[PDB]
């Protein structure tokens, strides 16, 4: 698994970490503005979240 959060697309940021939180209590949420690719890590400690410009969110998000 449960690396990855389609349930919560649409909404913003918070909104998401809420979930995301919810799904594994201990995901440290930064945001990343959708466009900015990124890494092949396993930044586990992340649900790495491409939002848009009004930190909506535009791609599904996913861990590490």
């Given at each position: 698994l449960k690396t990855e959060w389609?349930?919560?697309?649409?909404k913003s940021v918070e909104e998401?970490?809420?979930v995301i939180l919810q799904d594994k209590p201990e995901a440290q949420?930064?945001?990343?503005?959708?466009?900015?690719?990124?890494?092949?890590?396993?930044?586990?400690?992340?649900?790495?979240?491409?939002?848009?410009?009004?930190?909506n969110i535009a791609q599904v998000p996913r861990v590490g």
């Open positions: 389609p349930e919560l697309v649409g998401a970490k809420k949420i930064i945001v990343l503005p959708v466009g900015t690719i990124v890494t092949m890590e396993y930044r586990i400690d992340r649900v790495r979240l491409f939002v848009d410009k009004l930190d």
